[PDB]
Design a protein around this nucleic acid. Structure first.
Ligand SMILES: [Mg+2]
Ligand SMILES: [Zn+2]
Ligand SMILES: [Zn+2]
Ligand SMILES: [Zn+2]
Lengths: 192, 526, 98, 240, 77, 65, 35, 44, 98, 115, 255
RNA sequence: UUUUGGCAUAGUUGC
């Protein structure tokens, strides 16, 4: 009662301005993204030239996949930390995440800077077509966007390919909820 | 490919697929395959020239059609199998253009990426600024909205129908809507929404509406039901007849009023009726007579709107009766954005109680800010901003998904041109004290849809009503009445609580108390 | 009366063969909004079948680009199975190969 | 068949012994209400007017139950039935005869549910003890159930459009049982993982985070207006 | 020598309060002086705090035997 | 279907301006210019005439019965 | 002669409008039933 | 009682034991005439 | 006369075929009603597009839970004849023989 | 269907008093004025006017529930002054201010009309 | 220990709206005054509606709802009028009500517009405010619409159709000197029409000892009442409410 | 002067 009656005097919101960072922040994010893209290109051409040597107990594809995966992971984390640095004290996203009442730091990094890598089954987007994730890419491509790394933020807006790959990613979560509602509590119904 | 593009021997749905790695050509002309149009590209150049577009612009009074573009071999249908053998271009304006070439051999180019969307997903403004589970939620919910489902609904007599009093085309709309005919049959209202915390009735995905706006017809709708009944002379044992019965001629009857009906055993339209009344006075002759008249579903009231009388396929006189019932928005009615922001009406406040801007503008709806961060419906915020800009600019905005020319920066600049905060945050005054609210408030028009679920449609109680005939337990018949499943999980919860007497009451005394005499030497019922 | 039956109840196959005759083809038209009617007109259903248990069709496959909506399906136990056509999708009506 | 009548969930054992439809229950949609204590539940007028509780006639409540019998089913609060010790059920919507309404000790009146009564609030599915909890009735003049914002997270129910159930106990024995075992205050600490099961939620939690910042300062009138809402206030304004 | 605990379990509290409240509702004598109360639940709680309810609990031990306890003998918490 | 009598938010009369809005549109006024000519400044009222669809014209085509 | 980038953004939607004017939204059911 | 033919709007009375038919059109759909009972509305 | 066949609304044999919107208003039919469905017993019944595996097409899969390492199958079916679709499987056994 | 009669949101039905007084027992000189069929319109203004008086140690009000129409005003003054006296003085001050404002507003209307 | 001495300054006077400033007053008084503007300035609106016959495409309660929101010129008549539930009459009388009649019979193939012009009062002191005019419903050949209505005294709190104001713009502290709001970046914000901050600043210096004053009002009428009449009747109604409350409190204390 | 009443498979929809 007392907190709501005070909140009338204070008030709380969320706005477009709460999702805006500095132009310097966007520039730094874009520099990090281009750095990560160039690094993934280096790993791809190394694997192409048979210059990538596999790690022990792992095939060359596993080594390459783990390398590019961790490259995208630390690129995403660096961009997220830079976005977190750019937040103001009045940013309602930071108000809702620091309080812990809703959202998380990952959500802020998603909305402001980088949605990030999509996944199905714990891997990048598979070649549904022969050696191609979509017809818009060339055959035998393993770049980030070609295998389904979203680079824009939600505010920046997804590209068509990135939008479709994120739809594929969310379909996995919807399937997870469906099989949850199927198999939830049958364990409990036997246990009781 | 030449002949298909010329349509000489090959109709333009036959797909030809050349697999080089296996040295095979498969040609399919069967039904059941799915294809889509695609523009043809040669020498990294479109075959679509500006003269074709000029011929398209004069479509009427020219008789130039899409089939000419099919005939000229500029656009061709491609199926999913043949798509494997295609190097497709998303957009011609950059990808086929010379650059540090990602690819230098593009055979086809897409007409527009937004056509990947569905029929009920295409209405989403800025769908590429939302978490795709929200897009699935909106696709599901848009089918559930209220609106003018068809123009001739007045003549139709459907089972259940909903009509919104004052529909509006969305202020922010994708161009695809122009071909949906949803711009001409809209379903929803553009309403001023302010995303802000308040007294505490908006929380956990709820919404606080302006009572005054509802009193001005905001989101007011009508719900039409239709009942039907036929008579018949089946054999000679029975003959149902439309006629109002009386206790003096029908020696078996239900306690209710019957004076609403006329001499034909039917109710005149324009009579205001409750759920327990009779709409069709109809009775069967015992082998005096007994009633089997038709009552209303005993959870509602309405007006018998239209009574039609005709003959069935056999020729027996049968009648349908459409009953109107106005539905004012009330607490618990479910409203949704075009971004999956589903919420029930938490409370209604009059205009003076509601907050308001410096110009006297009050918000029609107030939603919890905390609905946004986890869901990440940023398309909702951009839709609100673009709606504000369109309304101030007096021109229907654009909501094409992948239109690169539009972004929040330009929208903010356009908003700043009209003497508003560029991000849409506004100073609002508390209606209870008039004090400036400390934090500023994001506000603007947003398209909201009254979903077809209302509380009076889904609410009931059980107070020792019409029990079963097989187990004497409450049954679902004549209404939602029939109690509730006291499922095994509820029993188990009471075992955890240890409320054994409460469990006994719910399972035995409150459901089907019975007793039987049994022998004390054998278990046989006496 | 045969076709009238098979459209009247949704069962598809002979009326006495309802034990194994696949059903769920003809449905009451969704008349609540114009968009709902359109979405029900263009709806496509994948049966569970024996093949659904070998390959998981609930996941959105890449080949559904430009033919089926990436995000339009009933949220429940029918996620992925029931889908809707993309706007420019058109289905081959069949012709003779002669 | 006989076997088919018993197998599965829909058979007699799982469908009509371990769980079944039950009289004296209602179900509808929920909406938030911060002006209610956690142990209080707002109910529509119609359900309380329909759903009832059996009160035994005693020399203390004879006047109140007599007035309730006089009111009848038409008005709220009222009653439906007089159950005398003989078992005869006098229905209070068809017999406006004063010979039928004369009361005395030992009778049982089926009076309409009113404020302060006890109900069990519930939701499909039930996953733990707090999925069914005891609440105190509050009549509010609208067509949906209410809930305090804090009792949502034990039930896992948000106000998106999911519905909840309400089971009315009938006997004083089980009423006391729900009072002393299943009420919301007794269920604050779960025995699952030895912690509180509920806490402070979205708007309240963000608002208190902003409130307890070091630089929040409040005028005299604001402080006095806020101290109104503190129910457990001593009445003494502390030194600023 | 009653070996069981001298405390009243919450279930015993629930049952004894419910039964005594029903007894009071059935025009039973009240073993405490009321103070204008009308609800049997409050009167039963007052009697429990007074330790003036005539009920005797019979706790069945798992071996078939049992212990008997006066309500005033148990520790009300 | 028909134009609302009043703007839902603020309550200004708008039911005497839809026909005039159409008439000024036939004068090739920009829609913003038309709404300014009809004295609608707050965007609450401008939403009404900018987003209203007058389906009553399509409904009168049927028989009067 | 060829479509410029500024004009393509409306030319493509003119093309789609011509498509839906020709074929409509329920072409599948009607064509299948006619066949 | 009085019914309106659904095509040509021919008002006509029909008995309780004759199949319906328009007296000048042959049409076989009839609609009941509006009630002659007092109907009122509060404008809220 | 051998029977009666339901007619899809606004199909080439429907009365509403090729009429103008004004004529549809004379018939009390909405010009925007897309049709493409049937009326059975007055109720508007619509058919849902049924997805099934294609015919006449060799497909090589791997039945991991079989005595076969692989299986090349073909659902062979005549054009407009022999609705029984003969499905053949030719499968290479695994080397776990007796 | 359970929507309340809105016209019974400001009208005292039978057996309802407009205002009642309850002397709070926690603190001396403390009274609670419960007014039915009222809202923030009178509560806020009366709260401010009571806060103007220096002799009023504490003054506040609340609405226990927005759907209901009770307002409860707590007033505590010095121990030489009645809270009812403070309430009556506040009402008289507000009525005098509004009469003065009406007079000045009529004068301003006439001035703008001639001007 | 007494209420302030307010001073008024009418900046703009028009027949549809009015703009003024109240100085030397408390915030709560101003908030209650605007609340009374929206809520408790009574007017006359068509409430009771008997449909003698309807044949339009639109059902009856739609037409009744549309007729409800028609504003009516009730400048002087609303004072001598009384609430129907208070007056002693069978259903209606001139002391508490005004009768309206409407009847349009369209037998012309050209489209017909049943407008507010067609409303026929039995007293010329109250008419539709437009009497272009408000469209009520379009009619075709063969469609009639006949009805009789009654308009009665009421105020906006009971229902929004009795709301006389089409929006009440309110402002105070346009320079944010009191800092009741906290701009995260004051540079971005537009200046009010009353703000005196030049175009090189964004906030006045924070005055600690300040208090709300200089309340700016722009009351827009629907035209049912003149704006000056709205404000005068608002103050009169609030004074009436407070005097009645004083009477009840005196009776309570004497009891 | 007292009211009753079906079982079924299929389909869609809602946390
Ligand atoms: Mg939910
Ligand atoms: Zn407006
Ligand atoms: Zn005829
Ligand atoms: Zn009178």
């Amino acid at each position: 009662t007392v907190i709501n009656n005070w909140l009338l005097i204070e008030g709380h919101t969320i706005g477009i301005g709460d999702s805006i960072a500095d132009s310097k922040t966007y520039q730094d994010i874009q520099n990090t993204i281009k750095k990560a893209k160039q690094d993934v290109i280096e790993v791809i051409e190394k694997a192409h030239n048979n210059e990538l040597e596999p790690t022990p107990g792992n095939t060359l594809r596993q080594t390459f996949e783990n390398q590019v995966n961790r490259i995208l992971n630390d690129a995403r984390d660096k961009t997220g930390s830079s976005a977190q640095k750019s937040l103001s004290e009045y940013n309602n996203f930071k108000s809702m995440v620091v309080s812990g009442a809703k959202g998380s730091k990952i959500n802020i990094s998603q909305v402001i800077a980088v949605v990030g890598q999509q996944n199905v089954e714990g891997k990048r987007i598979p070649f549904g077509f022969k050696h191609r994730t979509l017809p818009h890419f060339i055959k035998d491509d393993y770049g980030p966007e070609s295998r389904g790394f979203v680079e824009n933020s939600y505010l920046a807006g997804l590209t068509p390919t990135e939008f479709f790959f994120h739809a594929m990613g969310g379909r996995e979560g919807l399937i997870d909820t469906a099989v949850k509602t199927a198999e939830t509590g049958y364990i409990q119904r036997r246990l009781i | 490919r030449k002949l298909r593009r010329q349509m000489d021997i090959i109709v333009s749905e036959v797909s030809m697929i050349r697999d080089i790695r296996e040295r095979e050509i498969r040609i399919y002309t069967d039904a059941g395959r799915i294809c889509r149009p695609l523009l043809i590209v040669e020498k990294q150049k479109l075959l679509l020239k500006k003269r074709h577009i000029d011929q398209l612009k004069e479509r009427e009074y020219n008789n130039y059609s899409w089939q000419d573009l099919v005939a000229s071999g500029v656009v061709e249908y491609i199926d999913t199998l043949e798509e494997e053998t295609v190097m497709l271009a998303m957009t011609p304006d950059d990808l086929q253009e010379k650059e540090v070439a990602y690819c230098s051999t593009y055979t086809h180019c897409e007409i527009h990426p937004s056509m990947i969307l569905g029929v009920c997903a295409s209405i989403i403004p800025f769908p590429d600024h939302n978490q795709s589970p929200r897009n699935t939620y909106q696709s599901a919910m848009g089918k559930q909205a209220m609106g003018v489902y068809i123009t001739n609904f007045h003549v139709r007599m459907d089972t259940l129908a909903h009509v919104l009093y004052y529909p509006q085309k969305p202020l922010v709309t994708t161009r695809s809507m122009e071909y949906l005919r949803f711009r001409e049959l809209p379903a929803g209202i553009n309403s001023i929404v302010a995303i802000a915390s308040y007294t505490g009735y908006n929380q956990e995905d709820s919404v606080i509406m302006n009572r005054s706006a509802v009193d001005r017809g905001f989101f007011r709708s009508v719900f039409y039901r239709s009942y039907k009944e036929q008579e018949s002379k089946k054999g000679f044992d029975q003959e149902e007849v439309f006629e109002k019965p009386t206790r003096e001629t029908c020696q078996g009857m239900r306690h209710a009023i019957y004076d609403k009906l006329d001499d034909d055993g039917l109710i005149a339209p324009g009579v205001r009726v409750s759920g327990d009344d009779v709409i069709i006075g109809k009775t069967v002759t015992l082998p005096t007579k007994r009633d089997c008249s038709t009552f209303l579903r005993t959870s509602e009231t309405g007006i018998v709107d239209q009574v039609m009388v005709t003959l069935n396929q056999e020729g027996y006189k049968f009648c349908k009766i459409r009953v109107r019932s106005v539905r004012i928005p009330q607490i618990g009615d479910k409203f949704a954005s075009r971004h999956g922001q589903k919420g029930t009406c938490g409370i209604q406040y009059r205009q003076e109680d509601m907050p308001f801007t410096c110009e006297g503008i009050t918000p029609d709806i107030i939603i919890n800010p905390h609905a946004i961060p986890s869901r990440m419906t940023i398309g909702h915020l951009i839709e609100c901003l673009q709606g504000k800009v369109s309304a101030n600019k007096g021109e229907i905005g654009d909501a094409t998904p992948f239109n690169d020319a539009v972004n929040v920066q330009k929208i903010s600049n356009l908003l700043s041109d009209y003497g508003y905060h560029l991000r849409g945050n506004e100073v609002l005054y508390n209606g209870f004290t008039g004090r400036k609210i400390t934090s500023q408030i994001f506000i603007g028009p947003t398209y909201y849809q009254r979903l077809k679920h209302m509380v009076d449609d889904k609410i009931h109680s059980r107070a020792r009503g019409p029990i079963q005939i097989l187990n004497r337990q409450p049954m679902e018949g004549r209404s939602r009445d029939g109690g509730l499943r006291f499922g095994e999980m509820e029993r188990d919860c009471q075992i955890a609580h240890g409320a054994a007497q409460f469990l006994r009451e719910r399972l035995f005394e409150a459901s089907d108390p019975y007793q039987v005499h049994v022998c004390n030497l054998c278990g046989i019922m006496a | 009366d045969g076709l009238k039956y098979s459209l009247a109840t949704g069962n598809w196959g002979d009326q006495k063969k309802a034990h194994q005759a696949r059903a769920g083809v003809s449905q009451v038209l969704n008349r609540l909004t114009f968009a709902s009617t359109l979405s029900h007109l263009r709806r496509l259903n994948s049966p569970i079948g024996r093949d659904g248990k070998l390959a998981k069709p609930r996941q959105l496959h890449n080949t559904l680009w430009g033919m089926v909506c990436p995000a339009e399906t009933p949220e429940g136990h029918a996620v992925g199975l029931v889908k809707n056509l993309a706007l420019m999708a058109y289905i081959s009506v069949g012709s003779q190969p002669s | 068949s006989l076997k088919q009548r018993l197998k599965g969930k829909e058979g007699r054992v799982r469908g009509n012994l371990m769980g079944k439809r039950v009289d004296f229950s209602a179900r509808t949609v929920i909406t938030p209400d911060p002006n209610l204590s956690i142990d209080q539940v707002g109910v529509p007028r119609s359900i309380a007017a329909n759903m009832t509780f059996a009160e035994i006639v005693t020399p203390f409540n004879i006047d109140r139950l007599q007035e309730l019998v006089r009111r009848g089913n038409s008005q709220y609060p009222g009653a439906k039935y007089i159950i005398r010790d003989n078992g005869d059920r006098i229905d209070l919507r068809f017999h406006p005869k004063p010979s039928d309404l004369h009361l005395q000790t030992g009778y049982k009146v089926e009076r309409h549910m009113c404020d302060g009564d006890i109900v069990i609030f519930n939701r499909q599915p039930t996953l733990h003890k707090m999925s069914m909890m005891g609440h105190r009735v509050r009549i509010l003049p609208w067509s949906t159930f209410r809930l305090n914002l804090s009792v949502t997270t034990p039930y896992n129910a948000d106000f998106d459009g999911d519905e909840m159930n309400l089971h009315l106990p009938q006997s004083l024995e089980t009423r006391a049982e729900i009072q002393e075992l299943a009420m919301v205050p007794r269920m604050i600490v779960t025995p699952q993982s030895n912690r509180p099961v509920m806490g402070i939620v979205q708007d309240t939690l963000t608002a208190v985070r902003k409130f307890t910042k070091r630089d929040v300062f409040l005028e005299r009138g604001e402080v006095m207006n806020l101290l109104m809402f503190l129910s457990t206030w001593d009445g003494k304004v502390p030194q600023p | 020598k009653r070996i069981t605990t001298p405390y009243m379990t919450k279930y015993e509290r629930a049952r004894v309060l419910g039964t005594r409240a029903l007894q009071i509702a059935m025009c039973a004598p009240v073993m405490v002086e009321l103070e204008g109360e009308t609800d049997p639940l409050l009167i039963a709680m007052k009697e429990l705090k007074a330790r003036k309810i005539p009920i005797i609990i019979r706790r069945y031990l798992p071996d078939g035997s049992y212990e008997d306890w006066g309500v005033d003998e148990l520790i009300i918490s | 279907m028909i134009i609302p009598v009043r703007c839902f938010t603020c309550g200004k009369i708008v039911g005497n301006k839809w026909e005039a809005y159409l008439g000024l549109l036939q004068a090739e006024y920009t829609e913003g210019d038309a709404l300014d000519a009809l004295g609608l400044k707050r965007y609450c009222c401008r939403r009404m005439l900018l987003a209203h669809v007058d389906l009553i014209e399509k409904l009168l085509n049927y028989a009067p019965l | 002669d060829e479509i410029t980038p500024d004009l393509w953004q409306e030319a493509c939607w003119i093309v789609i409008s011509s498509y839906f004017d020709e074929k409509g939204l329920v072409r599948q059911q009607l064509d299948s039933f006619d066949e | 009682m009085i019914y309106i033919c659904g095509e040509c709007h021919t008002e006509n009375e029909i008995k309780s034991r004759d199949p319906i038919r328009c007296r000048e059109c042959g049409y076989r759909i009839m609609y009941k005439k509006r009630t002659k009972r007092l109907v009122v509305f509060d404008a809220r | 006369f051998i029977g009666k066949i339901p007619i899809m609304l606004r199909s080439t044999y429907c009365l509403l075929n090729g009429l103008t919107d004004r004529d549809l208003c004379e018939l009390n039919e909405c010009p925007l009603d897309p049709g493409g469905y049937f009326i059975i017993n007055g109720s508007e019944k619509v058919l849902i597009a049924q997805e099934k595996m294609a015919t006449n097409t060799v497909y090589v899969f791997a039945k991991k839970d079989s005595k076969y390492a692989y299986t090349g199958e073909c659902r062979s079916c005549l054009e407009n004849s022999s609705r029984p679709t003969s499905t053949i499987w030719v499968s290479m056994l695994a080397r776990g023989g007796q | 269907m359970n929507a309340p009669p809105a016209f019974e949101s400001f009208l005292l039905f039978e057996g309802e008093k407009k205002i009642t007084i309850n002397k709070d027992t926690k603190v001396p000189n403390a009274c609670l004025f419960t007014i039915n069929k009222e809202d923030h319109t009178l509560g806020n203004i009366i709260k401010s006017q009571l806060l103007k008086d220096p002799q009023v140690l504490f003054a506040g009000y609340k609405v226990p529930h927005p759907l209901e129409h009770k307002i409860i005003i707590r007033v505590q003054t010095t121990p030489d002054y009645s809270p009812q006296e403070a309430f009556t003085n506040a009402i008289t001050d507000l009525i005098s201010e509004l009469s003065l404002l009406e007079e000045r507003f009529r004068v301003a209307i006439k001035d703008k009309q001639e001007g | 220990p007494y209420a302030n001495q307010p001073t008024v300054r009418i900046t703009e006077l028009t027949d549809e709206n009015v703009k003024f400033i109240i100085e030397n007053t408390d915030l709560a008084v101003a908030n209650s005054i605007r609340r009374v503007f929206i809520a408790e300035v009574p007017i006359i609106a068509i409430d009771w509606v008997q449909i003698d016959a309807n044949s339009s495409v639109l059902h009856d309660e739609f037409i009744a709802h549309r007729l409800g929101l028609i504003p009516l010129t009730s400048d002087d008549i609303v004072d001598k009028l009384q609430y129907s539930r208070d007056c002693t009459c069978e259903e209606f009388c001139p002391e508490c009500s005004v009768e309206f009649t409407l009847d349009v019979r369209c037998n012309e193939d050209q489209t017909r517009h049943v407008t507010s012009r067609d409303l026929i009062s039995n007293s010329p002191r109250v008419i539709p405010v437009t009497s272009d005019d408000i469209l009520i419903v379009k009619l075709r050949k063969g469609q009639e619409l006949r009805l009789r209505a009654y308009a009665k005294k009421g105020f906006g709190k009971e229902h929004a159709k009795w709301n006389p104001t089409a929006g009440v713009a309110f402002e105070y502290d346009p320079d944010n000197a009191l800092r009741h709001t906290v701009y995260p970046k004051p540079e971005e914000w537009p200046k009010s029409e009353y703000s005196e901050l030049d175009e090189d600043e964004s906030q006045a210096p924070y005055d600690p000892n300040g208090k709300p004053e200089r309340f700016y009002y722009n009351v827009e009428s629907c035209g049912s009442l003149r704006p000056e009449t709205i404000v005068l009747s608002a103050l009169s109604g609030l004074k009436k409410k407070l005097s009645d409350l004083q009477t009840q409190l005196s009776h309570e204390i004497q009891s």
